[PDB]
């Protein structure tokens, strides 16, 4: 069967509502990132070396989330960005480790000195690491994921990008204890124009979670979050937390340097946004109204008990 | 079954013509709001505080319908509103009381002194209540309608807005007379952005209508109505009345304000419509076209003897 | 069953081509009107003020086609026009009467002088009549039918525009010719806006066509040709001929007055086209390439050894 | 049945990543053109009068490809452009002939002086030839290739444009050597606009390949290529080569001249592309990639292991 089936993007559909018991403000946005790792509020920022750096990392951090240091830099620079994290200086829902101290991951790829790079990641502290991958489902991907557990065994990880049942059966075998979900999501995409390749998030989270349910893995959504309607939509699917990039980019903690054109200001160009503060409020309102629709009190409770309708566009 | 259902918008879906044996004069517009209170066109205008005050629901009042005069004031205010409703001084369609005073009502939400307002509504001697909430179908607002339905029994009660057939079983059982039908009805709408949520209006109405079959309940379609075309399908879906707004914001008896911009007219910015009395003619006339097309004589027979083609689009 | 089926228009759809043995030269393009009248190309110019009186009539039926003048005029100017096309002084395709005079067809809807204008047409030797309607599967319109045809029994009748099998039946009872098929096959059509009724054109022509079929009634299909290519979908759905109107309104036989608009050149404003055979002769054309994809030396080898593929769009 | 199927482009799919074992660099781009000719990249260029001329002949020759000389000039100039690819004078991948002369075909239509262009074309020692046809599956073109198959024996052919199966039994049953795929792939093409005729390309292609699975009888994907991940889906879905026009109209060894407009430069007018060798290293690199994300080591991998997702669009 050539054409398998049809797969559903964040737009080809909608939530059903449901008698609900709490009020958006009574709802909890507690979630896991590992077994091991917990978050206060289920985002995470970008490994992109557009958006999330040490500013980027504590900002979110002190909100509730965690922040991915890029891999785009020197192995020394990437270490300095994980101790200012670690050591930095009210946020009710900052997100530390057992130390009191700032949570932060950092991100990494094949290269000739990847061990090398985790080595002094770890030895900065590192919570988790991303291992970085276009393609997760690879043997040499695979074969990292064996190397890096091996040699840090208690080294939290969240494993290359997969739309697959079959690829999450493989990297958990090797220990991923977090799988990331996302590649070719839309028409637009680089993957999906370049290589043709690519299958839309909702399916792609389902079909993972469909796999991983009953587990203690979980699922992060990567990619194509433009809404707080959208992370809604990639909780219910099956997603822990989403990991967001673009609509950070513009904020005053992305890495980017802030520029005046006109009257309007910009990062340097995309339009200012202001504090990631702000746009963390507007996202996480947006999810507790979500969740307040759907009756679900907890974010365990938005992936079980909810439901979609197809939306025939229109 | 995560994915229920294809659920269908009024872009998805025409209506088939059928052997007629009436002219679209000869047809009756006269529908029910409740069991006790009729209406002689299947109007109401919206409970927005851009489009319904006293000016407006007198004016819809003497064309037919009725108007909901929005709970964004203080609780004097609107009490004083519904008597200048109440007290108004040819309109052969005149929708009144049964002491020939023009018909009107009032929307409130959950507040500390919603039982306070309706009190005071219900002095100005109101003839319908409209419990206004984004999600009807939760535990807060029908524990309203009990309390408001023990304090005042003779109210008539329409209650929050809903779209599936659980939610209208619930508020039923409470005492509501008439459901309004509604929620994230389209991509642009504000809680399919920001909470993911909603479900097309023909499968809304047709999911509560499905369940209310059979019952002295009645519906109201609130929402995305942009053409007389909308209300047609509406009404064939199983809607009893339609509620507008939007298209009537730009009236003369919108709570608007009328402005010359360098020779053209608006309301503040949205475009001058006229009277309302126009735009409702224009939107009976496509009305009537549409039973004449159906061959209903009646809005029971357009929605009974009535049904849709789906629109692949294109 | 609500929402009976999924309804195709012309771009919902595409022609598969088949073994051909024809070239686009060797093919015919004779089709039948009705059992008495037959067509030398499969065209008919539309009943409107905007593209059909004698000067159209005259053109279209030297082509090979027929003409409808329009009924948006006194009954004497009506019959003045038809007198000036049945008076007329190379052209091979010239569609003639036994009397070697140019075919030409007339309009009339019900009014009060319905059948004073049809005595006056019938005297002016009009070869066939539309009983033109929005809603031809009417009491009334099957009434005037009835009347028309026991006062003159041999006028060939198009009977008024309908969209289904059960129309069909009941026009064919009372002894229609010929069925005009098209209502609101377009969301932008003013039928779907304003009555919110309609469906699309293929699916219309396919239903009546499907019921037609084995009797000697014929079928035209009315509205929505953009292209040849709708031309060729149209038939090869079951229509024996195309009724057209907007491709037309911009010739120079079209009732318009020429205009010259800086330069260019224009209809009232629409952009000039040409003499009509210009575009006719584009639009036989592509109907004879795609006879010769399809392999159908005639027009009844299009109708029945044809098949279509549906496009998902993109 | 009268609507045979649903019909995909390259739009409505993508493609589902692979457990991967090989890197894209490690990829193998070698294909067949016909059982006696393989090309080292899968690429050809059209026999377009805007496209391929001795110039790109020679230029994608040297990449790995082989271009179609155009018939639009006289039978003189065919050989003479033939003449000059085959007499050229580092490039790792060009393709040449057992003579170490660089590949090249040229495209014949139906014509009074057919054999007598062939007869002039084989002389120059033309490596392939294309019977150049708008539909393939005619008597007139299953002719044609009889009497050049019986004139010329040794001489591989590729046939007509067909998309569909029995098609391809046809012509294959009288000798077509590699069979090219394409005919109104696309709403905006000219076959679909004037003759309502066409198959979107990737049922097109699945639907001869699911014929000539087999078989040793090649699939060349003829146009509708716009990004290199429409290479990737064409070849997935059983195609062996690509033929290319639009993409390379704009590049320096196209027919066209180069033209500098204030600053910019062009062919002509369409921008400039620059040398061929440019987007060819554009269109592998994609290929490989997503080959990559299939585990495809070779084309004939990509074609058997390789499965879809519907793209519902959104």
Known sequence: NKITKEALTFDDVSLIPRKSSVLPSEVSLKTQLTKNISLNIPFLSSAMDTVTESQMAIAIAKEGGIGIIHKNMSIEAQRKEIEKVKTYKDFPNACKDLNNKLRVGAAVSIDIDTIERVEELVKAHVDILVIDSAHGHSTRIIEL???????????????????????????????????????????????????????????????????????????????????????????????????????????????????????????????????????????????????????????????????????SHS
Do not use: H, W
Request: hydrophobic content about 40%; overall charge positive; some cysteine.
């Open 145 to 311: 994921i064996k190397k890096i557990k091996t040699k840090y065994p208690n080294l939290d990880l969240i494993a290359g990008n997969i739309v697959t049942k079959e690829a999450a059966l493989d990297l958990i075998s090797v220990g991923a204890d977090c799988l990331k979900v996302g590649i070719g999501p839309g028409s637009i995409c680089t993957t999906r124009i370049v290589a043709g390749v690519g299958v839309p998030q909702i399916t792609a989270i389902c079909d993972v979670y469909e796999a991983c349910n009953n587990t203690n893995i979980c699922i992060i959504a990567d990619g194509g979050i433009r809404f707080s309607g959208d992370v809604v939509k990639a909780i219910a699917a099956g997603a822990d937390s989403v990991m967001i990039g673009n609509l950070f980019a513009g904020t005053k903690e992305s890495p980017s340097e802030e520029i005046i054109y006109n009257g309007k200001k910009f990062k340097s160009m995309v339009p200012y946004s202001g504090k990631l503060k702000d746009i963390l409020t507007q996202l996480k309102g947006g999810l507790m109204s979500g969740m307040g629709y759907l009756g679900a009190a907890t974010i365990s409770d938005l992936k079980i008990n909810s439901k979609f309708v197809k939306i």
